[PDB]
Amino acid sequence: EEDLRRRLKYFFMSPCDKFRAKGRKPCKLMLQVVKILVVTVQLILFGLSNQLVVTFREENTIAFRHLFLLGYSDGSDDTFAAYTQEQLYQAIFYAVDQYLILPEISLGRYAYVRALALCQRYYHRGHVDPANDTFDIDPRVVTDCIQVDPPSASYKNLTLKFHKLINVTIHFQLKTINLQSLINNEIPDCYTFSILITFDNKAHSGRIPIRLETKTHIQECKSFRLLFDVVVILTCSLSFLLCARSLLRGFLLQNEFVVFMWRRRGREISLWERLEFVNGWYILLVTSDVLTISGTVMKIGIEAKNLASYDVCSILLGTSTLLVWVGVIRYLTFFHKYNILIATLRVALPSVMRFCCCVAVIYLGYCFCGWIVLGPYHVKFRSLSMVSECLFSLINGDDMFVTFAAMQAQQGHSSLVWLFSQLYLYSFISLFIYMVLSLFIALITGAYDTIKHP
Amino acid sequence: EEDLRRRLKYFFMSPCDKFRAKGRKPCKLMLQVVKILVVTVQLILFGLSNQLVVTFREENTIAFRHLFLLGYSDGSDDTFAAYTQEQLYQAIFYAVDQYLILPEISLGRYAYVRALALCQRYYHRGHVDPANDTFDIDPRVVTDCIQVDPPSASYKNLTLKFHKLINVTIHFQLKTINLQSLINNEIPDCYTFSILITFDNKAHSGRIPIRLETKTHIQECKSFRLLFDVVVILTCSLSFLLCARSLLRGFLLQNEFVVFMWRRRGREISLWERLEFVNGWYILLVTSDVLTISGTVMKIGIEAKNLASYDVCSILLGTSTLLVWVGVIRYLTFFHKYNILIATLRVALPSVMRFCCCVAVIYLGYCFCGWIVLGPYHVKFRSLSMVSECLFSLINGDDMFVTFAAMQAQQGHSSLVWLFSQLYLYSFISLFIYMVLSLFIALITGAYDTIKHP
Amino acid sequence: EEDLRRRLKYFFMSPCDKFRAKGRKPCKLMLQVVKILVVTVQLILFGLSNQLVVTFREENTIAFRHLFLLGYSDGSDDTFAAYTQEQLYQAIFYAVDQYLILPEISLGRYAYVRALALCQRYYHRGHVDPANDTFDIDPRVVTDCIQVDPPSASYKNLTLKFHKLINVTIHFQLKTINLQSLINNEIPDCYTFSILITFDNKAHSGRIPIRLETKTHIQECKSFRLLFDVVVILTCSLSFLLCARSLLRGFLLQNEFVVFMWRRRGREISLWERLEFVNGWYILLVTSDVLTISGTVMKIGIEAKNLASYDVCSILLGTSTLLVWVGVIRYLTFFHKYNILIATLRVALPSVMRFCCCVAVIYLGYCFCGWIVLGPYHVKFRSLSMVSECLFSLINGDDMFVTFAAMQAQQGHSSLVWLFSQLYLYSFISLFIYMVLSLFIALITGAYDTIKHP
Amino acid sequence: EEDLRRRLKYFFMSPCDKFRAKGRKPCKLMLQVVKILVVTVQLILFGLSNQLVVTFREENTIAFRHLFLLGYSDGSDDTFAAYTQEQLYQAIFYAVDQYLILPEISLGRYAYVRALALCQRYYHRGHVDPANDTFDIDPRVVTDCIQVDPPSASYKNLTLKFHKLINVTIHFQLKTINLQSLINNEIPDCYTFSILITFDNKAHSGRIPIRLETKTHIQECKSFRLLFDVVVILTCSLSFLLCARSLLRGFLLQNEFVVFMWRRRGREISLWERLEFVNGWYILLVTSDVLTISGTVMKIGIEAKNLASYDVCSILLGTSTLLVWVGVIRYLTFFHKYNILIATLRVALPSVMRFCCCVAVIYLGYCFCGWIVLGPYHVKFRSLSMVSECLFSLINGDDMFVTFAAMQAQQGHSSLVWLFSQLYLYSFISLFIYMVLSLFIALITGAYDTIKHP
Ligand SMILES: *[C@@H]1O[C@H](CO)[C@@H](O[C@@H]2O[C@H](CO)[C@@H](O)[C@H](O)[C@H]2NC(C)=O)[C@H](O)[C@H]1NC(C)=O
Ligand SMILES: *[C@@H]1O[C@H](CO)[C@@H](O[C@@H]2O[C@H](CO)[C@@H](O)[C@H](O)[C@H]2NC(C)=O)[C@H](O)[C@H]1NC(C)=O
Ligand SMILES: *[C@@H]1O[C@H](CO)[C@@H](O[C@@H]2O[C@H](CO)[C@@H](O)[C@H](O)[C@H]2NC(C)=O)[C@H](O)[C@H]1NC(C)=O
Ligand SMILES: *[C@@H]1O[C@H](CO)[C@@H](O[C@@H]2O[C@H](CO)[C@@H](O)[C@H](O)[C@H]2NC(C)=O)[C@H](O)[C@H]1NC(C)=O
Ligand code: NA
């Protein structure tokens, strides 16, 4: 078949060779430049909206913490607590008293929403007695709510139950108007902050942490976006059909190649020669194509009705734009100078992934060994996730002297954990910097030397 | 002997070759997968207990420091001291006054244990007189204890002896009940905190540091563990007998090989050919086997009676689990692609250990040179351990600009230590990053090239 | 042409060969040593002036912040704000009251300049009402200035408009005399500080930041420089004519080489053989020559009349001195041992720049992916510039554990961004340290091996 | 000459070959093991004395800062200053009032030494007038001392001259007794602290920094060392004569080799063959030998009379011990496996030192370019030393994100320095990590490959 050879001349032909031979063929290549530009501009333009929204969220939450938390200096979100009995009464009474006089205090136009509800939660049959070691506990949790309305004995005389206490929560809402939007020449977005001050007594340890949490329900008051957002799906869908048409030809031209080796007696050639016939780049491009058109329909559903679930939308558009940019490495491999550079990973990957298991095992071994031993006597090694972040930080070198000095300052309780800590940390750091990183260098150099000489 | 050749065909045979030839042989290999799973699950399940115990320890100790230490802001454990005469009286009197009214203050159910005992320790014949330089010192240390019982002149009128003073210690106990255990659906663990507030006057320098230390005596109040903890020793002992049986065959089949070369006149072959006959992996597996069965019997002795010595138990189980995971590199070397990767250290180790001595000497030389010279004029170089941690941190690069700026900010006392500090630090950092790390890279690359071509 | 061959013997001849053959030829080489010394001494002598000027600027600005800002502890320039209504009145009234009694307070000789003007700016028709969601806004900004003269009702009774407020600015000037100049034995420089205290209400979020800014107008009161500053331009201009004369010979001797290959039928030789004939070092030297003579005329215009625009002057002299020092690598390549070392980049540059695009794309991909996703739930990833600085810091390893712990401490809002953060950060750090840095090492080693064997 | 060949057989013979041939020759080698042990034990034993001395110095200096400085919280040595007029009067009056009542306040036995002298220094003819710009200055500095004797108008009514003020210094002495020495079972060391509180008004900027400095005059009150300190000089002198005897033989056996090539007509062989005949290790050993015997005589002169100049003594003993440890690399090169490892630097050094100049030039170029440009607008780049420490810290990677964020937070004054800062820092970091470190790796690998194959 002299035509099918001429097809395979044209199937493996680069478009540069095809342009200098045929001409008038940008029909595939113009899309994959437009699609890069259209997706990334859509990403940046959407990414500048969340700067204004999140900074107007964060500044209002800080301005709530100075108004409703007693004695709050900044940079102390974690080590802020109430320890005696009177500090908890003062922290509650200050919050409600700073709520009731809010227009004569604050600096924004914080209106009210019809309001405040105080509630404590205590065990039903609580009986704790360390002198006699007697317990008789019903674990049913009963609440005791107090209603407070804004414009003392309706609110005061609130006696807590410190011998059985779980949470004391304060819940109220505030409504305000973004005034920056008129400077940005648009229709405003009236927000609704939902504040939940939490006094936690979960561990029953006499250390009650205090924290404040907000939540916004964005809504309009009493088109460069939507025209562009149908362009980003029209381009991407047109590429989704045009690329799938090419893989459809790839499967069918593969299929009449499998036909010949039953007539030429090619002994039913296995997975190797048929992997050298289907492009792999269109796989990455089509799995970019699904994610962009999913995320933009999601974004239409965001701005229309539900201004909350930015999570799935952002995690799809960012991963789509990540996969589209790597699809420009497609263009570079048509040159005979880049073609050495891109072919350095196709031979190393079935060896460097073989070595990555041998590193991941030993790394996981030092994770389990370090976490149980240096769990109690150290602060960087509490949970297994935090051990994994600490040991992976120490490899490139982030925080060595802090991990050493935190061990030396207390020396554990006895000298056996300190003498173990010296051998543990020195052997682990000396292993992965010298003998393991070096092995990785040797593998990539040998894989490059395999590509260079032929 | 045609049978002994057929034994050596079967002795060096991989189990993959043995399964594809014989079949029905998982009898060795099923243990070393079960033993990985059983040990590590036992480790994680024991490792989650100490999270609840240690966090209930640490939160109660912080809640003691806010209640009994005068003017304690957090993050100031080391630079907390008493300097004048009245600050020490106020720091003692505040601690006892905050002890006597403890139920009307604290937030836990801290009961008392029959109580408080104040005691100061002073030299018998103390005579310090810098005007006349006269000393007449009996170094016998006499205590002066005060008994305080909880429900002023029994406690007040406590005049210290500031011209001869060693320690002022306050000792008392508190008993409480963990209430988190009922949420975790079990029998509680009544703790007993033992508090020792220490006012140290050891160096006699007018800087008395203040610190608080606790100690717990865990005891029950007035079975997924123990069934699993006999599985972890039954599996490991069965592997301890089954592996030792294999090394017993290895020594005996070695022994009748030594017999032949006295009849074949093999001239009493030395240590090389007989090292190529005994496996080394069973050595690591059997020294895992001793440590697991020692640590779990230790853990039974922990939870039954003595809830204190977690040190030896944790340092054995963690090291055992460390050696079991590295024993999965055993499995990878049966493939002819991993067999290049694992053979990169067998030839480098009698050369990279030859180079590790040449690095450890020069490193130790900069330790002794830096510690005496930059001892006084610098804060990172106090003890020799702290010099070793600082110089080893600077190699990968942790804290360079802090070590430079601490030198520049004072410039020592004169410019000779600063001009020495610049030459010391620049020559040391430039030595081990460029010329020494590079040598390590060259050694591993040459060792890989020795394995690759044959 | 036997003479033109003898010219090309002399044109490519090194001056070391030319000195050992001819002698009495330093006429080119003495300039390029003098020009290094003259430029760098001019740089250091100018660079020591700005130490005295800027430290006398910074110390006076700190001394203004302690005098005019209410409750200012150092290291808190960013988290200094006013949150309630009364804190803003106290922060304004404290600043003007500390202005009027300034000679009986301060420690310098701060005189007055005829003075203080307070001004607030508010919207004309401001109507914000979150209860009814009604707005009727004229965005014209009207000021309301108050005049205050130094030696209460002229200044007091200043009622702000908190429901429509943009800026409250305080502007005044202070004149002082540098007394360090008499110790430095010269004519003094009377400064004029121009202070602008700013109360910003741009975002309308109830968080008003406070900051103080100064500006100096240096002027003399009521010659080693200028003699040296004409030497630095006389030397550099003489090199500017002497080097351009050599490139003029280079173009003309190239031109009569292009003539021959039309008579010898050399087929109009392209860009390669004619690039091996023009020196590239004189290009760097002449673009040093333009920048030095531009910056020093600029510096004359600075010290004569306009003591403000140090920006263009410094950015030209520093870049000129940067290009002059690299012009000493010119001297080293005449030796046959350095000639291997300098020839390691001429062959790698059309391959390592080919690889730098393949790294810059993937790096830019992780920038766009990380910024939108971890924008809201993280503080290091606010703007795209700050993402680029954070991801480039993590490659060599700067701040890994802070970026991990800031993610773990809040876990976002839900676990999907945390589970995305672990995969994002681990894949990105493992990519550029192991597989990409290693590729760079392999390229430079192969480029050196290309130069070494021939 | 068959004997001189037999000498050269014995001259280049290793002692291992000489022991297995001759025997009873430890006469050279026993010294160089004893000398390592004797010097380092002398170093450690002297190095443990300065821990007790310097910590008794530092704790007393901190205890002075809490007693004599008004409002001193720790960690604030640099940002502690007095800004108004009344803060300087209160800082002086608090220091003298806390001096006069010192036994009823402090916790040590601080006696007095006959005492306190207050003194201020002001210009004689001071005339500063920014309204009229008139100056008439006599730079002669006149002091005004006040005498204060310990057991108000003798001390009060101290009117400063704020319009001409240089320093206000307070000087007094305190004597105490180290009581730790009786616990260490010895004769005590009565110290004499010399305190100099300094109020600096050098820059005349209205920011007066405050700092306290002490100085000790150690003296005894009203032998494992000295026996060992003559051993360390007896051993080292005996090696100083025994090694110089060997180099004396080396010069003389070289001399009768130069004789032969005038009779054999060897054409007066140059520096190469005569460098392959003199050992280089005895040069390092003899320059260790001078420094040890100098430093220990210095140490005798320290402990006898002058307990001050620890500078020259420590900087000689530390450098001597540095050179003695590297002299154990001498021993390793006798083995034919280490002999490849030690020979990796003899061929690289006349090439890696050729490359170190090409790096030091470009590094110095970025130092001069960065210091003038980013001098004013940045805090890490003030002096040229601090630029060199900052740029050298950024290469291995220490403090990248702090240097980037300090630039971004202010953006200079205008955007031109910020746009210059991005290009400066990115080009410099990308240059030395990728292209320059990689070049270093290639040089050491090629130098190892030159040694490996022959
Ligand atoms: C305070 O404690 C109560 C429990 O006593 C919490 O109520 C639980 O809330 C979670 C939702 O996060 C539910 O799944 C549980 O079923 C609730 N338990 C009960 C008994 O209601 C309450 O959420 C806590 N407060 C805060 C702010 O977390
Ligand atoms: C306070 O100082 C006394 C000594 O004056 C300490 O008592 C010593 O304690 C250790 C145990 O750690 C014993 O080995 C010594 O023999 C004890 N000496 C005497 C004289 O009793 C006491 O422990 C110190 N206080 C604290 C809390 O450490
Ligand atoms: C306070 O806000 C006003 C605007 O209400 C600022 O005035 C603007 O200043 C910039 C110059 O930086 C001009 O380009 C604008 O046209 C000005 N707008 C108006 C309405 O005048 C003022 O600069 C702000 N104060 C400070 C200190 O920045
Ligand atoms: C306070 O300032 C005076 C100068 O007014 C300093 O006196 C100088 O001290 C140095 C020694 O360090 C001498 O070289 C100078 O000659 C002295 N000058 C005069 C005029 O006496 C004094 O040292 C400063 N105080 C401190 C603590 O440094
Ligand atoms: Na750091």
Side-chain angles (χ1 to χ4, degrees), chain B residues 121 141 166-167 169 196 198 211:
Chain B
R121 294 175 180 88
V141 178
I166 298 97
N167 281 324
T169 62
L196 188 71
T198 301
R211 66 266 186 100

Side-chain angles (χ1 to χ4, degrees), chain A residues 359-370 391 424, chain B residues 318 321-322 325-326:
Chain A
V359 176
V361 167
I362 298 173
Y363 178 77
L364 190 60
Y366 281 101
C367 290
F368 286 109
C369 178
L391 288 177
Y424 179 80
Chain B
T321 311
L322 179 62
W325 278 100
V326 182

